[PDB]
Amino acid sequence: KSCCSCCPAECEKCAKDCVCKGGEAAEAEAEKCSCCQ
């Protein structure tokens, strides 16, 4: 069970809280996040 579609279900950054409240892309479908890279 995860809390997003850009990180695994064992991410450390997303352990305390989903820190993926970013992404300024309307026509750039990415398969990863910077905050957690």
Which parts of this chain interact with Cd ion (CB under 5 A)?
A: 3-4, 6-7, 11, 13-14, 18, 20, 33, 35-36
**CA 31 vs CA 15, 16: distances in Å:** 20, 22
29 assigned ligand-binding residue: no
Is 33 labeled as ligand-binding? yes
Query: Is 35 a known ligand-binding residue?
Result: yes
Minimum CB separation of residue 26 from Cd ion in Å reads 18
User: Which has the closest alpha carbon to 18: 30, 33, 3?
Assistant: 3
Torsion sign over Cα 26, 32, 36, 37: negative
Annotated binding site for a divalent metal cation: 3-4, 6-7, 11, 14, 18, 20, 33, 35-36
